[PDB]
């Protein structure tokens, strides 16, 4: 999530969007015995400042 | 059994285009009764050989109705051999009465109902008669054998 | 400089979901409730109840 600039293509016309979305981001990992990539289809709510 | 595919909220610019896909086939991975649209979806066109190898590992499903919330389907063959349904043709050659049909990945790409709101695209496989699908597979596999 | 009063309209689109819960019942009860698998005894009704 640091080196990818595609969020800039998802241009920002409001700080409130950045706020209200930081608190409802999609969980990108799984619940297995190791940290694995998650199928983006299901979606799980995770907050990350 | 009737597979139920749920839909996210959609812009009217693409919901009306999805309505027109009432007789095409999609490829789930597991036969649960419910499944989200995001699950049943394939990346944009590439490596028709790989895709044709992937259709073997999953069982098909044809869709019948498209409501503003819900989109049904029908698992093609798991226990039935006479469930008469309707599916639309999308291959170049017109298929006549009598003969069987086989699913083949699309050529040249360009068949992608690219949905922007949901940020995904679908590639429905084309339907060809047996006699020509055999020949197409022959050509592609021979060409693969050309490259050592 | 002075500033005119400002107006602005706006619209929000709905969000739609759904629920589900299965209710499976058995074939023996199906046959005993209606009477397709009934019997003329005193033991049958004891099981239909």
Automatic annotation (TrEMBL), chain A:
Coiled coil: none annotated. This is Major capsid protein. It comes from Suid herpesvirus 1 (SuHV-1). The lineage of its organism: Viruses, Duplodnaviria, Heunggongvirae, Peploviricota, Herviviricetes. The gene is UL19. The chain holds residues 1233 to 1281 of 1330 of the full protein.
From TrEMBL, chain B:
The keyword Transport does not apply. Disulfide bonds join 44-112. Keywords: Capsid protein, Host nucleus, Virion. The keyword Transcription regulation does not apply. It comes from the Viruses. GO terms for cellular component: viral capsid. GO terms for molecular function: structural molecule activity. This is Capsid triplex subunit 2. It comes from Suid herpesvirus 1 (SuHV-1). The chain holds residues 1 to 148 of 296 of the full protein.
């Amino acid at each position: 999530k640091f080196f990818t600039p595609a969020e800039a293509v998802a241009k920002s016309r409001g700080l409130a969007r950045l706020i209200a979305d930081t608190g409802a981001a999609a969980s990108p990992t799984s619940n297995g015995e190791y940290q694995f990539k998650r199928p983006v289809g299901a979606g799980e709510l995770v907050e990350d400042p | 059994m009737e597979v139920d595919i749920a839909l996210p909220t959609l812009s009217p610019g693409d919901l009306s285009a999805l309505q027109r896909c009432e007789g095409r086939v999609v490829f789930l991975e597991t036969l649960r009764r419910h499944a989200t649209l995001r699950e049943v979806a394939l990346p944009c066109g590439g490596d028709v050989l790989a895709a044709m190898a992937a259709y073997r590992r999953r069982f098909a499903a044809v869709i019948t109705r498209v409501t503003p919330h819900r989109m049904l389907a029908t698992p093609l063959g798991v226990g039935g051999r006479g469930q008469s349904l309707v599916l639309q043709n999308t291959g170049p050659f017109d298929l006549t009465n009598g003969d069987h049909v086989c699913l083949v990945p699309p050529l040249l790409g360009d068949e992608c109902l690219r949905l922007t709101s949901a940020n995904l695209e679908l590639r429905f496989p084309m339907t060809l008669p047996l006699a020509q699908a055999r020949e197409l597979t022959a050509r592609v596999v021979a060409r693969a054998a050309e490259t050592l | 400089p002075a500033d005119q009063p400002v107006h602005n309209y706006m619209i929000k689109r709905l969000d739609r979901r759904s629920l589900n819960a299965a209710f499976s019942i058995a074939v023996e009860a199906l046959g005993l409730i209606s009477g397709e698998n009934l019997d003329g005894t005193h033991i049958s009704s004891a099981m239909r109840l």
